[PDB]
Each structure stands twice: as C-alpha cells, then as structure tokens.
C-alpha cells in the first residue's frame, strides 16, 4: 500500500546537519503523490516548503476532480446496494486510506474503518487498520491509537487465526525504547518472525533483517546472541546479501572494535534517516558504545588507556572522556586512572552482587510491608 | 514434470547455494528432498556420487 | 485520607502541552550534545597519521 515511509521523514524534516530538505527523495515523494493524487502530504507543503507555487494547486485541480469522482463512485456503490460484512464499504474505506489519508487525512478514514469494523466480522481488516494507522501515526506522531489497536488485536482479535501481529511490534521498536524497548521485546519478536516474514507490506526483507540485527545486538550483547542471531540461518543469508550489516555485527562479536566503531558510525548515520531516526539514534549509539566498552573491559583486570585507544579505534583522550562519562552514569563498572594510564575493573563477584541485590530487593519489600502494616491497625 | 534427473540436479544446486549462504538447515532440507527424489530414479553414478 | 490542603495543591497551569507526552522513560544522559562519530575519529587520528 504505502511502503516507502512516503519519504517524508527524509523530506525536509532532516534539515540542518542532516540537511535532507531537497533532493531526488522529493522527486520520489512527488511521483508517489501524483499517482493516486494526494493533498495530505501537501498540508505542510502548503505551509513551509513549496508553499504557494504554481504546481501546488495545478495538481490540486485534477486531484480534487479525481477524488470527487472516486468518492462519488463509492457513495453510489454504497447507497445503491446494501452489501454486508466485508463488502464494498470496506473497499470504500480502503480506498479512503489510499484516498483521504492520501488526500487529506486519516480522521475520516479512521471513522469509516470504525464503522465497517462494526459491520465486518473477520480479522484481517482490523490488522489492516492497525498498520494503516501505525504508519499514519508515524507520519503524524500517534502512538495511543497504535497501542489501542494492538491491544484489540492481541487480547481479543487473536482468538481465531494467528500469525499476524508479530511484526506490529515495529511500534515497540520505538515505544519504551531508550530504556528497555529498542531491544528485549523488540528483538524477541523480530527473532521469532525472521524465519517466516510474510509481511512485505510494511518493509522489504532486507530492511527487516537489518532492523532485527540492530535491535538484537543491543538486546543481547554476548548472552549467546550467536545461538539466534549469528548461528541463525536466514539472518546469515541476508547478511551475505548485506555486507555492511554483517561486518557491523561480526565486528562486535569477534572483538574487532577498531572496525566496529566505523561500522557503528555508519549505522548511526544511516539510522539518522529513518522512522527510527528521531526516536533513538543517539540512544542506540550510546548503548552500543557502552556495550562494546563493557565487552572489552570484561576479560580484563587493568587495561592501559593506550591499549584501549589503539585497539578500540582511536583517542586516548577520547576514550578517557567517554569512560569518564559512562562511569559517571553508573554503567560500565570500571575505575579509570590518570597519567599512570590504567583502567581497573571493579566488577563485584557473585557473592557481593548477590548481597547488594538482597539489600535492594529487601529494602523495597520492607518499605512495602512497613507501609502496609502501618495503614492497617492504625 | 516427470523428469527427475534434472530435478535432482536442480535440487542439489539449490542445496549447494543454500549451504554457500550459511543457510544450513534449509540446505539440509533441500538436500533431503533431493535424496528422496533420487531414491526413486536412475541416479547415475555421477549423480549418486555428487549427492553423497 | 488527607488532601494536604495546607500545602497549596500546585496547579499544573492549564494542563498545557508538554514536551512529547511520549511513553519514553529516559535517563540523564540523553540531553547532552554530540557531533556524530566519524568526524571525531578522523579528527583525533589524522594528527598521528590517519
């Protein structure tokens, strides 16, 4: 239906340093526009970029003509006949997404889809509206609709058939991301699906595999990710198709940090132009850095800063600053020494960490039990 | 098509490529299908040797 | 249950539009400034030979 993110994120929403404000991407968006003529991408285009040019209404004329003709056709087919369930009405709303979603908006289409959902019985229509409006709320920054539709599908709709919702975790790539959800869950369903994709509507297979690798290597640093993302068959095959992603993954796995950072810079930049850009490109490149640092610091007791810089890319002072910032944040258990130029790891053994966790969890439980006891018996 | 010797050739080639892509389980599945479809056909000594 | 009216229940103005209204539990480190990666790397090794 509407695959290429409508080029709108890369379009003039990536100005300044990314600078993406006019290029062949605008051409691609405009050809996707003129075919099935649309004015909805022209809202902001009626405001800031190509505000009041000749084409702005020179397309609007036959666009309005075509949409009026097709809406008239749908209204005639809806009033003349009385088709029930999955019917010409659902055709009217699916067009209305191919239309007013790409004429003016989702609101009319959301209403029409709600109506036909009240009228229909089968489930793929509900998944259709889920992904329709997930992408629409990626155009207009909507998440409550996505989670409402996801709950409707998973909790209630998924009692007949199955095998569909999994990829609609794409929202979970960007829901709780900068703490827990750019990974963990977003990887455990990408992995569970990479064998059986069957959802080419949202994204091609290669892009899906890149997303899966990206989220899995932040979900799993070396907790035997290899059992699922390196020994994985389909992932390996598509990586044979994608040299850059394969190098970026195996560099981290094979402790080739010098090239892992160059791969991570490339990932950051190519990630800064996506539906995934605005949410967490900064966060992802911080987390992967911390992950690689912890991987190197593990299996070491005291590392010379020079050895780090020569083996971790560059920047003795750069590495000093980064380690300082990351230890200050509480992650990356290690203590950095100055001009002696040593970095000492202070990872507590199992017993000491166990005692600390006992203290923490028991303090939580004790505060809870104290509160409970005091509100009872006055 | 009733032709199977060429079918076995194609299945073996598919398994070879699948192995070359590190897609080992799917390569094994294609090889098993080739073996099944060859245990019912002439399978000349070259094809048998190649399959083994 | 006490409503603690002795402390004025500080009204959140007019429930004005927030920053994001996102679901996005973040940390203290997400608010700093950064300048990509590769620039740093070349800028710190061409002094020694890159």
Curated annotation (Swiss-Prot), chain A:
The family database entries (SMART domains) matched by this protein are listed as: PINT
UniProt keyword terms in alphabetical order: Proteasome
Name the Pfam families on file: PCI, RPN7, RPN7_PSMD6_C
Query: What cellular-component terms does GO give this entry?
Result: cytosol; extracellular region; ficolin-1-rich granule lumen; nucleoplasm; proteasome accessory complex; proteasome complex; proteasome regulatory particle; secretory granule lumen
Question: What SUPFAM superfamilies does this protein map onto?
Answer: TPR-like, Winged helix' DNA-binding domain
What is the superkingdom listed in this entry's lineage? Eukaryota
User: What's any GO biological process attached to this entry?
Assistant: proteasome-mediated ubiquitin-dependent protein catabolic process
Report domain PCI positions.
Answer: 182-350
Q: Which PROSITE patterns match?
A: PCI
Q: Describe the task this protein carries out.
A: Component of the 26S proteasome, a multiprotein complex involved in the ATP-dependent degradation of ubiquitinated proteins. This complex plays a key role in the maintenance of protein homeostasis by removing misfolded or damaged proteins, which could impair cellular functions, and by removing proteins whose functions are no longer required. Therefore, the proteasome participates in numerous cellular processes, including cell cycle progression, apoptosis, or DNA damage repair.
Return the PANTHER family for the record. Answer: 26S PROTEASOME NON-ATPASE REGULATORY SUBUNIT 6, 26S PROTESOME SUBUNIT 6
* Complex and partners: Component of the 19S proteasome regulatory particle complex. The 26S proteasome consists of a 20S core particle (CP) and two 19S regulatory subunits (RP). The regulatory particle is made of a lid composed of 9 subunits including PSMD6, a base containing 6 ATPases and few additional components.
Q: Which family does it belong to?
A: Belongs to the proteasome subunit S10 family.
Protein name, as recorded: 26S proteasome non-ATPase regulatory subunit 6
Organism annotation: Homo sapiens
What gene codes for this chain?
PSMD6
UniProtKB/Swiss-Prot annotation, chain B:
Provide the free-text tissue specificity comment from this protein's UniProt record.
Answer: Highly expressed in embryonic stem cells (ESCs). Expression decreases as ESCs differentiate.
* Induction of its expression: By FOXO4; expression in embryonic stem cells (ESCs) is mediated by FOXO4.
Extract the coiled-coil ranges from the record. Answer: none
Record note on modification:
Phosphorylated by AMPK.
Q: Which family does it belong to?
A: Belongs to the proteasome subunit S9 family.
Q: How does it assemble?
A: Component of the 19S proteasome regulatory particle complex. The 26S proteasome consists of a 20S core particle (CP) and two 19S regulatory subunits (RP). The regulatory particle is made of a lid composed of 9 subunits including PSMD11, a base containing 6 ATPases and few additional components.
Q: What is this protein called in UniProt?
A: 26S proteasome non-ATPase regulatory subunit 11
Organismal lineage: Eukaryota, Metazoa, Chordata, Craniata, Vertebrata
Instruction: Give the shown range, full length included.
Output: 160 to 211 of 422
Curated annotation (Swiss-Prot), chain C:
Q: Does the keyword Transmembrane apply?
A: no
Keywords assigned by UniProt, alphabetized: Nucleus, Proteasome
Question: GO biological process annotations for this chain's record?
Answer: double-strand break repair via homologous recombination; mRNA export from nucleus; proteasome assembly; proteasome-mediated ubiquitin-dependent protein catabolic process
Q: Establish whether keyword Secreted is in the entry.
A: no
Subunit structure as annotated in this protein's UniProt entry: Component of the 19S proteasome regulatory particle complex. The 26S proteasome consists of a 20S core particle (CP) and two 19S regulatory subunits (RP). The regulatory particle is made of a lid composed of 9 subunits including SEM1, a base containing 6 ATPases and few additional components. Belongs to the TREX-2 complex (transcription and export complex 2), composed of at least ENY2, GANP, PCID2, SEM1, and either centrin CETN2 or CETN3. Component of the homologous recombination repair (HR) complex composed of ERCC5/XPG, BRCA2, PALB2, DSS1 and RAD51. Interacts with the C-terminal of BRCA2.
Q: What's this protein's family per the entry?
A: Belongs to the DSS1/SEM1 family.
Q: What is this protein called?
A: 26S proteasome complex subunit SEM1
**Species annotation:** Homo sapiens (Human)
Question: What stretch of the complete protein does the chain hold?
Answer: 16 to 65 of 70
């Amino acid at each position: 239906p509407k695959n290429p993110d409508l080029r709108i994120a890369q379009l003039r929403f990536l100005l300044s340093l990314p600078e993406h404000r006019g290029d062949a991407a605008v051409r691609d968006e405009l050809m996707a526009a003129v075919r099935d003529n649309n004015m909805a991408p022209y809202y902001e285009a009626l405001c800031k970029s190509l505000d009041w040019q000749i084409d702005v209404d020179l397309l609007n004329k036959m666009k309005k003509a075509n949409e009026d003709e097709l809406k008239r056709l749908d209204e005639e087919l809806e009033d003349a006949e009385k088709n029930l369930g999955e019917s010409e009405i659902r055709d009217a709303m699916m067009a209305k997404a191919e239309y007013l979603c790409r004429i003016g908006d989702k609101e009319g289409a959301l209403t029409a889809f709600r109506k036909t959902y009240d009228k229909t019985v089968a489930l793929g229509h509900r998944l259709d509206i889920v992904f329709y409006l997930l992408r629409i709320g990626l155009f207009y920054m909507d998440n409550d609709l996505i989670t409402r539709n996801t709950e409707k599908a998973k909790s209630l709709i998924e009692e007949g058939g199955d095998w569909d919702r999994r990829n609609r975790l794409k929202v979970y790539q960007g829901l709780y991301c900068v703490a827990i959800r750019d990974f963990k869950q977003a990887a455990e369903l990408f992995l569970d699906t990479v064998s059986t994709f069957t959802s080419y509507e949202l994204m091609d297979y290669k892009t899906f595999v890149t997303y899966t690798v990206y989220v899995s290597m932040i979900a799993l640093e070396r907790p035997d990710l290899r059992e699922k993302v390196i020994k994985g068959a389909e992932i390996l095959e598509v990586l044979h198709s994608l040299p850059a992603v394969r190098q970026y993954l195996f560099s981290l796995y094979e402790c080739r940090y010098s090239v892992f950072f160059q791969s991570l810079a490339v990932v950051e930049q190519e990630m800064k132009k996506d539906w995934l850009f605005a949410p967490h490109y900064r966060y992802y490149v911080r987390e992967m850095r911390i992950h690689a640092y912890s991987q190197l610091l593990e299996s070491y007791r005291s590392l010379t800063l020079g050895y780090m810089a020569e083996a971790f890319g560059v920047g003795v002072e750069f590495i000093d600053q980064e380690l300082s910032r990351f230890i200050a944040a509480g992650r990356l258990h290690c203590k950095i020494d100055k001009v002696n130029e040593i970095v000492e790891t202070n990872r507590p053994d199992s017993k000491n960490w166990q005692y600390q966790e006992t203290i923490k969890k028991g303090d939580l439980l004790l505060n809870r039990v104290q509160k409970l006891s005091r509100v009872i018996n006055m | 098509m009733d032709d199977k010797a060429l079918l076995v050739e194609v299945q073996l080639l598919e398994s070879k490529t699948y192995h070359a892509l590190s897609n080992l389980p799917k390569a094994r599945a294609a090889l098993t299908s080739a073996r099944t479809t060859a245990n019912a056909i002439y399978c000349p000594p070259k094809l048998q040797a190649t399959l083994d | 249950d006490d409503e603690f009216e002795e402390f004025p229940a500080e009204d959140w103005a007019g429930l004005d539009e927030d920053e994001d209204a996102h679901v996005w539990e973040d940390n203290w480190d997400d608010d700093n400034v950064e300048d990509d990666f590769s620039n740093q790397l070349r800028a710190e090794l061409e002094k020694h030979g890159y």
